Every structure is written in structure tokens, then in C-alpha cells.
């Protein structure tokens, strides 16, 4: 019912290897030639990516920045209100990046800040200007 395990031979294949006197060599010489073509391609991406790995020497260790601990205070100093409005214009609604900019305020206080000072700071107008980008 099934061919002996580890012996492959499908109805499809056998015909292709039987259609002509040299057909068996012809198909096998295709795969032989096709395998070298894919083999040469492999060398190419190895060479290409060996290059792309030199450009990444040193990683980004020198461009990295130290981290600062920062206890989330809930008071809004007049300065850090102003950082918020500029952030809003710079980012729009990335509540998280905005929280990162102030550095002492978390997304919630960040988030409802948009509502407590919505009138007083013309936040819609700021966001409207931020849309155009």
C-alpha cells in the first residue's frame, strides 16, 4: 500500500524520469546545476552580511545614555506644565513618551492632565496643530 519507509517514488516523479531515454539524467542535471546556483547565492549573502556586520562595530555603547531613577511626584510645577504642552505638540497622544519627557509623571496623571487643563491650555488647538504633520 505504501513504499518501504525511506524510499521515495511518487506517481508524479516516475513519469518524468521515464518520459525520454536521457530524461533521468536531464532532470538530475537540473537539480545538480540548480543546487550550485543556490549555493553561490548563499556565498553572496554571507559576503553582503559580513560587510553589514563591520558597519556595526562597537555597537552603540558610546552613543548610549545613562538611566535616572525618578519618583513619580503628583504636583505639577509651573515648569513641568510647560514641558507637557511642548511634548503634546511634539508627540500628540503618545502619553508614554510624554511621561518620559517630564520624567516625574506617569501616564495616568499625564492622561487626565489633558482634561484638567484642556481649557486653560487650548490642548485641542495644540493637538489640531500636531495633526498637521
Amino acid at each position: 500500500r505504501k513504499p518501504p519507509k525511506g524510499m521515495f517514488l511518487s506517481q508524479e516523479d516516475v513519469e518524468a524520469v521515464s518520459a525520454n531515454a536521457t530524461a533521468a539524467t536531464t532532470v538530475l542535471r537540473q537539480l545538480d546545476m540548480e543546487l550550485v546556483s543556490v549555493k553561490r547565492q548563499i556565498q553572496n549573502i554571507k559576503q553582503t552580511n559580513s560587510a553589514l556586520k563591520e558597519k556595526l562595530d562597537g555597537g552603540i555603547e558610546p552613543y548610549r545614555l545613562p538611566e535616572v531613577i525618578q519618583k513619580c511626584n503628583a504636583r505639577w510645577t509651573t515648569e513641568e506644565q510647560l514641558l507637557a504642552v511642548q511634548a503634546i505638540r511634539k508627540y500628540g497622544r503618545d502619553f508614554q513618551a510624554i511621561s518620559d519627557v517630564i520624567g516625574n509623571k506617569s501616564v495616568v496623571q499625564v492622561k487626565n492632565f489633558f482634561v484638567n487643563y484642556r481649557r486653560r491650555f487650548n490642548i485641542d488647538e495644540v493637538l489640531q496643530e500636531w495633526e498637521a504633520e
Binding site: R1, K2, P3, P4, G6, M7, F8, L9, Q11, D13, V14, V17, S18, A24, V27, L28, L31, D32, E34, L35, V38, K39, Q41, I42, I45, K46, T48, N49, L52, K53, K55, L56, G59, I60, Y63, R64, L65, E79, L82, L83, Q86, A87, K90, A97, D100, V101, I102, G103
Partner: protein, 664 residues
């Protein structure tokens, strides 16, 4: 039990055969009880003969030892016995006539060839009170059961193996004739061209692949019905090439999709690095920016403060994107190192591997005595169903004693080449010459002629035996279609055993696939220091046109390579077979050629009935009968098959001319 007898007589113990339906149509169409009785009566009689086959089993003797309820019907027992005795299932071979043989001879039969089929028919026909004479071209009986004998040296150049006593009639003959039977140890180490033994891990690999490839063909023939190609029948050799090609193809299909996985990832990585380099460049300049904004020292207005804080968030943000990317770069970096160290199979079979494969092919070309390119893919293994159980043996004293034992007490004209067979409505005329001087002409007249001419003889063109009138188109066509093969033997007589005497046989791997069979197998079978070297497949016919000395040379070399140049002395005496060259054989045994089938073996056995001498006269009796190894569909190319065919025709002939009184 009694049931062992039915098996040993090649008969299903629990149902009636087509044979018996013919002689006992009442019992088979009859109630299932009367059947069971019969089959027991059969099996038990078969038993009684079998237990001691050195004495005739007379009907009276049978009935005595049978007990009721079964010995109540004396006519059944008499019918059963007479049927068994007719068709040589009992009282065949070399028994001791209890009743000395009545000289009231009825009928005259001429048997062509003193071969084992011929020998067996002649004893049966004579056993049945007929006048039998055997005609014989050679100056010895046996035909293809030849046996070399010079001094202490003994070695058959014909058959040497008894394939199993499990249901083998040779079993009975080995008790009637003192045949010294020795088993054949299966272990056979292979030695390559250089002379070094194939390593065990390699041996087992190739052999397994061999059987693997043989299943492959069978699946391809039965399931895929790959049995015609270009309006030609497919041979086993073709179907093997196709299977090997498709395995060599699969090897490549595997490497192709392996590297395709590898280059998919390289490309997938190469596009990762591109993001990495561009992002790093971006990070590079955004640093400078954050730095320049940091340099404007405080006190600063909120926009200048915002610009430090935000270029700081911005640069950390890109520092996380690029951090996650070398997290992913590591994730593909090892995968490429894995798949490169998980490569699939380099080849399907190496040059050295295949050379070992060929020996398994040479061994298989010897078993069928023909190049695998000629064997029928569909049918070459149809006899491989009826195999006997037990292990294959050899005959230490030479297989020549069997024929000679049979030839006792028979009219055998040796040096008598039959040359025209002439059969008509009123009888037959066989015309033979003397072989030594073809001058002397002989005319033999008889009621029937039994032809055990080798198939290769029947094949010969122009014909070496003329049939008058000619054999009909259905019988000749069968003869063309069938395969007659060729397998040669070289016998090496030495004064000292320098081989492993616990190895019955060892092989030699040939250099190329073209000469795979040139002396690819050796046998240590005898008490005297003798080695036999086989020549199979394509090599066989090619080597018949080559000087013996040369052949023994190539032999010597091979052994020297295997055992060292100083351990192998010149052989004292040497012989080499040239079976296809022999004109009384013109081959070794029949094979199931492509385009042939088992049906042809049955064609070969149907007897010929001539046309009426006077038009309008009634249908005549059959006069030409055929036996011989090519005539027995179930057990061809074997000594037992020849024998059974001989027993068979003697049963057929006798029912025809003495009458069958056992059908009431």
C-alpha cells in the same frame, strides 16, 4: 501429524485440490462429511508412504493400517490409493517392488532425454507396466545434473543445492538414495577488488538497501502499475534503475530545500542588518544633537530645556528599537549555525557503495541465471511463493548419484541424438543418429513420445530437432517468449585448504557494474579441498569465449588478493562449464523473461494431439507430451521441478493409455 504428510506432499490438508475434484467429482460435490473422510484417507495414505518410502505401499498394506470409521468404504480407499499411486504422490522414486513387476507390458513410450524429468517419468511408466525406452544424446544420464569426478575430487557443475526439505520431494529421494546432505551456513563475507573485507557496518548497510530497492520495484509494479513503457514490458532491471534514479533525485531535492531554508534566513537577516545599520546611523546623529542641546548651559528657557529632555527620550527610544533588533539578530544568528551543521545526505550511494550493491545484483542474477535487464518485472518472483521450508543444502557425494540411482533398471540408449519427431493419428516415429558416427540412423516407433528436451534446445534456430508435423503456433510462441538463462561454474582443485573452512561461501566484489558477475562468489562445499567459482549475469555468456587458463588465472589472482600471494598454490585439476555452448542444453535453466508469464510454463506442458489421418475420422489421442523444468509453472528451473514434471506426465500418459479406473 497426518497433516504433516499433506504439507510435505505440497497439498492443503483441509480442502481438496483441483486435481482431486477431477478424479473425485462425486466427493467434492458431495456432503462435507464424505469430503473430510476422503481428505483424511488421502493424508493418512500420504503419511504411510512418507514414513517409510523405501518399500512399495500396496493398497492392501494401506487398508490394514487404516482403522474405522474410515476403513469401512473399501472402494474409496482403493480409489484414493490408485489416484495417489498414479500421480507419483506415493510409490515414486526408488522403492522396493513388493509385487514383482508383471512382464505383461502394455503400450510403448519413447522418452527423449535421460534427464531427471525423463528418468522420473520412465520409472513411473515402467512402474505402471509400460514399455519405455529413453533416447539420449550424451554418453551419461542426468543432463544438467552433471558431477565431476577425478580421484578424490567431486564437484557438480550442474545443480548442487537442495532447496529445503519442507515439502520437497527430494526429501523422499534422499532417503531412497544415500545422498550425503550438508547444510549451507548463510554467512558470506564480501571482499572488494583490492582484497580487503567489506566492513561489517558497510555490508549491512548495502544489503539492507538492496532489499529496500527490491521492495521498491514490487510496490512500483503493483501499486503504480509501471509494467509497460514505450509499448514494451518493463524488466526488473529497468524498474531498479528507475528506483535508484528516484532516490538519487530525492537526495538532491533534499539538499535543494535545505539550502533554500538557509538562504531564506540569510536574506531575512540581511534585511535585519540594514535596519540595524540605518538605525545606528540615526542614533549616531541624534546623540550629537542631544549633546549639543546639553552643551547650552543653564539657566535656560523651557523650550531649550524641553529640547534636552525630548532629544533624550528620542535617543533612548531609538536605543530600545536597536536593542530589540540585536535580540532578534542573535535569534537568527545561531539558526544559521544550526542548519549549516544539520546538512542532509551528501550522496545516495558512493562509487564504492554501488560496487557492493552490484554484488547483491550479481547474486540475484545468478539466482535467476540471467541479466536483470531480461527478467519480467511483474512476474520474475511467482515461484517465490511456493518455497520449501528448511535451509538449502548441498550434496557432498555429488548430485550425480540421484540420476544414476534412478537410471537403474531402465532402457537407456546413450549416444543417441534424436533428430526428428514424427507423430500421427496412429502412432509416432522418432528418428535418432549415433553421436560418435552420425552415419548410423535409428527409427523408433511408439504410441507416445515424452519430450524432456531442454528449453534451449527447443529454442534453437535453425532447429536441432524437427517436429513433423510442426509444433503449432501456440506452443512455439510460448517457446520464443520464455527465458532460457545461463550461469557458469569454475571448479578449483587444490592439495591444501587455505580458506576459512568454516565459511561455506564468500564473495568478491567486481570492479565495474558491467562485470559484476565475473567470479563473484566462491563455495567451500566438499571434504576435499575444492572451491567453486560462479560466473553469472552478463559475464556468463561472455566468459564462454575465453581460454580456461585465463579464467583460472583471473580466479587465482582474486584469491591471492584475498588470502595473500603465498597462501594460494596452483590448483592440481580444473574444469569450467560452458552451458550455453553445450548443444544438449544451450543454456542452464529457464527464467520468467519480460513479456512471459507463468501461463507460458503451462503452455509448455499441454500435450499435442495430431490431426486425423483420414478426414472425417474421430478426434485422435494426444501423442506428444512435454516434461522438464521449463514445464512446471510452480517449481521451475530446479531439479525437484524437473522431477515433479516427469512424475506428472507419467501420470498423464498412463491415464491416457492404460485408462483411469479410479473415476467411478
Amino acid at each position: 501429524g497426518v497433516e504433516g504428510a499433506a504439507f510435505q506432499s505440497r497439498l492443503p490438508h483441509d480442502r481438496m485440490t483441483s486435481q482431486e475434484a477431477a478424479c473425485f467429482p462425486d466427493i467434492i460435490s458431495g456432503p462435507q462429511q464424505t469430503q473430510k473422510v476422503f481428505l483424511f484417507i488421502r493424508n493418512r495414505t500420504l503419511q504411510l508412504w512418507l514414513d517409510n518410502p523405501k518399500i512399495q505401499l500396496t493398497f492392501e498394506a494401506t487398508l490394514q493400517q487404516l482403522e474405522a470409521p474410515y476403513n469401512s468404504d473399501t472402494v474409496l480407499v482403493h480409489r484414493v490409493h490408485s489416484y495417489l499411486e498414479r500421480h507419483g504422490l506415493i510409490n515414486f522414486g526408488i522403492y522396493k517392488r513388493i509385487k514383482p513387476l508383471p512382464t505383461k507390458k502394455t503400450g510403448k513410450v519413447i522418452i527423449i532425454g535421460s534427464g531427471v524429468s525423463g528418468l522420473a517419468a520412465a520409472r513411473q511408466l515402467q512402474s505402471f507396466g509400460m514399455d519405455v525406452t529413453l533416447l539420449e544424446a550424451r554418453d551419461r544420464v542426468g543432463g544438467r545434473v552433471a558431477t565431476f569426478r577425478k580421484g578424490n575430487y567431486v564437484a557438480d557443475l550442474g545443480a548442487m543445492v537442495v532447496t529445503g526439505l519442507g515439502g520437497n520431494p527430494m526429501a523422499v529421494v534422499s532417503k531412497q538414495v544415500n545422498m550425503e546432505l550438508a547444510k549451507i551456513k548463510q554467512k558470506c563475507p564480501l571482499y572488494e577488488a583490492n582484497g580487503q573485507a567489506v566492513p561489517k557496518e558497510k555490508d549491512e548497510m548495502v544489503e539492507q538497501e538492496f532489499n529496500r530497492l527490491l521492495e521498491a520495484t514490487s510496490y512500483l509494479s503493483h501499486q503504480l502499475d509501471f509494467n509497460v513503457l514505450n509499448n514494451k514490458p518493463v524488466s526488473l532491471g529497468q524498474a531498479l534503475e528507475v528506483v535508484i534514479q528516484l532516490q538519487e533525485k530525492h537526495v538532491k531535492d533534499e539538499q535543494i530545500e535545505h539550502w533554500k531554508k538557509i538562504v531564506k534566513t540569510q536574506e531575512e537577516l540581511k534585511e535585519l542588518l540594514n535596519k540595524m545599520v540605518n538605525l545606528k546611523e540615526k542614533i549616531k546623529e541624534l546623540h550629537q544633537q542631544y549633546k549639543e542641546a546639553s552643551e547650552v548651559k543653564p539657566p535656560r528657557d523651557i523650550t531649550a530645556e524641553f529640547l534636552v529632555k525630548s532629544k533624550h527620550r528620542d535617543l533612548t527610544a531609538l536605543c530600545k528599537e536597536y536593542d530589540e533588533l540585536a535580540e532578534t539578530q542573535g535569534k537568527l544568528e545561531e539558526k544559521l549555525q544550526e542548519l549549516e551543521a544539520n546538512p542532509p545526505s551528501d550522496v545516495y550511494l558512493s562509487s564504492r557503495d554501488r560496487q557492493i550493491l552490484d554484488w547483491h545484483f550479481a547474486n540475484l542474477e545468478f539466482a535467476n541465471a540471467t541479466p536483470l535487464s531480461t527478467l519480467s518485472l511483474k512476474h520474475w518472483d511467482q515461484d517465490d511463493d511456493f518455497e520449501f521450508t528448511g535451509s538449502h543444502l548441498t550434496v557432498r557425494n555429488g548430485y550425480s548419484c540421484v540420476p544414476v540411482a534412478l537410471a537403474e533398471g531402465l532402457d537407456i540408449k546413450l549416444n543417441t541424438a534424436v533428430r526428428q519427431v514424427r507423430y500421427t493419428a496412429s502412432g509416432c516415429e522418432v528418428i535418432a543418429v549415433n553421436t560418435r558416427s552420425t552415419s548410423q540412423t535409428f527409427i523408433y516407433k511408439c504410441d507416445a513420445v515424452l519430450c524432456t528436451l531442454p528449453l534451449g534446445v527447443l529454442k534453437q534456430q535453425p532447429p536441432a530437432v524437427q517436429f513433423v508435423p510442426p509444433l503449432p503456433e501456440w506452443k512455439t510462441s510460448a517457446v520464443q517468449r520464455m527465458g532460457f538463462g545461463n550461469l557458469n561454474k569454475v571448479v578449483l582443485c587444490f592439495d591444501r585448504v587455505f580458506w576459512d573452512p568454516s565459511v561455506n561461501l564468500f564473495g568478491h566484489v567486481g570492479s565495474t557494474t558491467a562485470s559484476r558477475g565475473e567470479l563473484f562468489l566462491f563455495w567451500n562445499l566438499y571434504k576435499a579441498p575444492i572451491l567453486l567459482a560462479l560466473v553469472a549475469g552478463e559475464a556468463a555468456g561472455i566468459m564462454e569465449n575465453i581460454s580456461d587458463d585465463v579464467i583460472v588465472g583471473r580466479c587465482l589472482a582474486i584469491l591471492k588478493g584475498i588470502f595473500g600471494s603465498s597462501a594460494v598454490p596452483q590448483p592440481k585439476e580444473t574444469v569450467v562449464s560452458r552451458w550455453r555452448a553445450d548443444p544438449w542444453a544451450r543454456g542452464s535453466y529457464s527464467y520468467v523473461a519480460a513479456g512471459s508469464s507463468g501461463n507460458d510454463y503451462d503452455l509448455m506442458a499441454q500435450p499435442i494431439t495430431p490431426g486425423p489421418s483420414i478426414p472425417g475420422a474421430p478426434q485422435p489421442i494426444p501423442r506428444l507430451f512435454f516434461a522438464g523444468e521449463h514445464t512446471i509453472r510452480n517449481y521451475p528451473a530446479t531439479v525437484h521441478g524437473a522431477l515433479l514434471s516427469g512424475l506428472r506426465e507419467a501420470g498423464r500418459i498412463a491415464d491416457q493409455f492404460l485408462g483411469a479406473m479410479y473415476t467411478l
